Amino acid sequence: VKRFFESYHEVPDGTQCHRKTYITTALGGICGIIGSAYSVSLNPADSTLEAVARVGRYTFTAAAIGAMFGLTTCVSAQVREKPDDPLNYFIGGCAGGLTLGARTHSYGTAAMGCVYMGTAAALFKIGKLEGWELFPTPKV
């Protein structure tokens, strides 16, 4: 149930967007659940339903940012024909920033979100391109 997410990376970027979007949407959604959970455990709700709603809101919003990121990056790559280009991701990251912005009904957040999120995603692309290692084993 992990061989899955990884698949996103295996096929060249810009190709098989369907899978990409699905995977990206799941990750966002997973984060949504976790995020809602912390948001409900602490700062609890008033009624069971109210909290179920939260969970839903956070889950969907996160799933959305996941989708548009996946969709935009894949499509940009295909259209721009740059199979591996950090910018592709930035376009996508920005997209997620905007979505989040919408779901929060704020243009400003979209601004915050477009740059920060995009930059972050772009760095992910570079990271993969340059073989950056995260959480590395001690090799001293």
- Report the interhelical angle of 107-130 vs 48-80 (nearest 10°): 60
Beta strands in 1-140 (DSSP E): none
49 interacts with other proteins by CB under 8 A: no
3-state secondary structure of 134: coil
d(CA 14, CA 69): 12
Residue of 33, 34, 44, 79 interacting with ligand 3PE (CB under 6 A): 44
Q: Please identify, using beta-carbon distances, which residue of 4 and 132 lies nearer to other proteins.
A: 132
Query: Hey, how many other C-beta atoms are within 10 angstroms of the C-beta on 56?
Result: 12
* Residues between 98 and 117 that touch ligand CDL (CB under 6 A): 104, 109
3-state secondary structure of 80: helix
Q: Which does 132 bind (CB under 5 to 8 A by kind): other proteins, ligand 3PE, ligand CDL, none?
A: other proteins
B/e letters for 16-28, b = 16+ CB within 10 Å, e = fewer, are ebebbbbbbbbbb
For other proteins, which stretch binds (CB under 8 A), given 46-54, 59-67, 91-99, 130-138?
Answer: 130-138
16 interacts with ligand CDL by CB under 6 A: no
Residue of 6, 81, 105, 138 interacting with other proteins (CB under 8 A): 138
d(CA 39, CA 86): 33
Q: Which residues bind ligand 3PE (CB under 6 A)?
A: 37, 40-41, 44, 104, 106, 108-109, 111-113, 115-117, 120
Q: Which residues bind ligand CDL (CB under 6 A)?
A: 31-32, 34-35, 38-39, 42-43, 58, 61-62, 104, 109
